[PDB]
Amino acid sequence: SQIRQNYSTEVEAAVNRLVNLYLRASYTYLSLGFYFDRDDVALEGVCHFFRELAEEKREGAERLLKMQNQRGGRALFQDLQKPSQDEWGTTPDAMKAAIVLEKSLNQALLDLHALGSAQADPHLCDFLESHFLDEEVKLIKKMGDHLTNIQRLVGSQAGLGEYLFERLTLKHD
Amino acid sequence: SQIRQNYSTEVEAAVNRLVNLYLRASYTYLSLGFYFDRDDVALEGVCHFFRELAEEKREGAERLLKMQNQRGGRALFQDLQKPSQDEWGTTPDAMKAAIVLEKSLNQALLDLHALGSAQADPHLCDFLESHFLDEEVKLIKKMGDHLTNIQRLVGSQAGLGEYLFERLTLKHD
Amino acid sequence: SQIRQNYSTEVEAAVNRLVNLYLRASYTYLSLGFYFDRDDVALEGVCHFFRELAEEKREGAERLLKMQNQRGGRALFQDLQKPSQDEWGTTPDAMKAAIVLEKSLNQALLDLHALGSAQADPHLCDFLESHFLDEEVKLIKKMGDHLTNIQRLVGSQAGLGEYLFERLTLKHD
Amino acid sequence: SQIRQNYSTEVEAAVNRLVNLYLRASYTYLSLGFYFDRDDVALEGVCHFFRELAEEKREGAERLLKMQNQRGGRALFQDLQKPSQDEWGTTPDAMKAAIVLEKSLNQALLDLHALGSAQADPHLCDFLESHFLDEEVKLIKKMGDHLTNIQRLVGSQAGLGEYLFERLTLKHD
Ligand SMILES: [Au+3]
Ligand SMILES: [Au+3]
Ligand SMILES: [Au+3]
Ligand SMILES: [Au+3]
Ligand SMILES: [Au+3]
Ligand SMILES: [Au+3]
Ligand SMILES: [Au+3]
Ligand SMILES: [Au+3]
Ligand SMILES: [Au+3]
Ligand SMILES: [Au+3]
Ligand SMILES: [Au+3]
Ligand SMILES: [Au+3]
Ligand SMILES: [Au+3]
Ligand SMILES: [Au+3]
Ligand SMILES: [Au+3]
Ligand SMILES: [Au+3]
Ligand SMILES: [Au+3]
Ligand SMILES: [Au+3]
Ligand SMILES: [Au+3]
Ligand SMILES: [Au+3]
Ligand SMILES: [Au+3]
Ligand SMILES: [Au+3]
Ligand SMILES: [Au+3]
Ligand SMILES: [Au+3]
């Protein structure tokens, strides 16, 4: 093969697509982060939050690529589509966008799981379970918690609420 | 006995009942804590507050059980009734529920004191005085202080106030 | 949801039931422990053994509750039924009761696995596999080993055997 | 007085009697200890156990005497009657004698409590509660536990059982 064993072409292709989705997510977080770094937005904790996520998504893509080679599949790259927005609105708007994005990654993981199970590829299933599935669940829970707190704050009064959330919940210098 | 001395059947039974009340209190705090851990509630400091109290009430029950055996009484366990609510409302609602619960434990301690005094059981009285009575008074004072602060904050505006109390008064990561 | 994804109502309910089973197990171990602390039983190592298990079962329940919220399910609590006995007999009687209890928890885990697999919920399966299944297998093996040793000892002569097992196998001060 | 306040002659006398009882207990433990040091008895752990108790009872007497002077009472000493036996039999015989002795001290403490309460002497009650009542309860519990273990062992077979208890339960070099 010289190493490929029990690794379907279907899974190989799906893994390449998942790499693209993770890299696109990383790119979206890069855009989110720099938006919050604008002098007319200026929420450092929010920038920091999304910058860390950009790194996390890139790391996920890299782990997938490492696994592709470990199994004897061939990494193939496609264009990275630009993020869906150029401007990201308020903190709740951005957190909602983030949750939508993570749910889409999670669904792709679940779809790849289903394919792995169909193809009887337990190494793939173990890989997703060990490095991806719980990471996504934890992240989405954190995002939901954040969204609840931001919504509670901006419903009281928006400017003040956004400031307090960035200062008191998010990590900043 | 071989060890039982000056330990009435009345006190023995009352101690078993008090164990049940402390364990039920622990269970109520477990429910309170996880309620505040919900993604649609998301007040970590409040969860932490009640989680610590769950541990404290369990420890109280365990001390009572240790004492039961020290005196040569027989520990007897009954069902632990589920907590009185499945959902606990707002931070002030939960703090009020907590104060009601602690006052009920305190009254049970006082009732056991009265029984001890009636039965001329100074070891029991010393035990309650040394490990329970002041702990309850201190806890109830803290709860009252908390309730006053939360009420002051949510009367200004509720969402904002609940967030600020959780961030600035309660212990969180 | 705002976070719930691929999490069936069937699994949500089963998780609540499993929390109840773990808490009931914890309660049974609390009773076992204090029984061995009786002055007319007086086997400290046995008390210590069951006290540690009470903590372990409570921790299991708490992990399940954390997961319930991570997935966006709603924790619901029911009564904790009192343990099945008030007095627990000899060390072998108690160890047998413990094995029966652990096998019942293990079967509940396996049943939840089956449900997870039926519902195509790999996060649930990963969770059970990572935090529960091997813990149960290890514990049951230890219990079986203990039971074999106690049986070997009490068949030689009971009082002496029970003492030696508590002194030389079990952890004590 | 120049210092005596709220300290009845009844309590003063009872305290002197209690000093005598504690010193007599100390003397009994001295005899118990040296009995187990006999070459034809030779149970070092048992000797050590009773030697420590002799010290504890003497310390109790000394605390009582200190309190007598703190309150402005006059310490008065009487003969210390020799212990009730010259030879103390087997380990269970000795442990039974010890429990009888401690129960008698505990009853004397309780009687002094009753007198204190009758005389409205809260300093006396606090003193007994803080330094004596729980110490006695703890000691008697330990003795009961010991007796249960020794009885379990000597009912299997006496010589072997006595050796094992001294080696594996009691503190020795
Ligand atoms: Au940035
Ligand atoms: Au920045
Ligand atoms: Au930044
Ligand atoms: Au799979
Ligand atoms: Au598979
Ligand atoms: Au956020
Ligand atoms: Au909590
Ligand atoms: Au929490
Ligand atoms: Au918490
Ligand atoms: Au009292
Ligand atoms: Au009293
Ligand atoms: Au509070
Ligand atoms: Au125990
Ligand atoms: Au114990
Ligand atoms: Au123990
Ligand atoms: Au499964
Ligand atoms: Au599954
Ligand atoms: Au065992
Ligand atoms: Au000696
Ligand atoms: Au010696
Ligand atoms: Au010695
Ligand atoms: Au008194
Ligand atoms: Au008094
Ligand atoms: Au002894």
UniProtKB/Swiss-Prot annotation, chains A, B, C, D:
Any GO molecular function: ferrous iron binding
GO cellular component term, pick one: cytoplasmic vesicle
Keywords: Acetylation, Cytoplasm, Cytoplasmic vesicle, Iron, Iron storage, Lysosome, Metal-binding
Annotated Ferritin-like diiron domain residues: 5-154
Record-linked InterPro entries: Ferritin, Ferritin-like, Ferritin-like_diiron, Ferritin-like_SF, Ferritin_CS, Ferritin_DPS_dom
Role description: Stores iron in a soluble, non-toxic, readily available form. Important for iron homeostasis. Iron is taken up in the ferrous form and deposited as ferric hydroxides after oxidation. Also plays a role in delivery of iron to cells. Mediates iron uptake in capsule cells of the developing kidney. Delivery to lysosomes by the cargo receptor NCOA4 for autophagic degradation and release or iron.
Annotated protein name in UniProt: Ferritin light chain
Organism, as annotated: Equus caballus
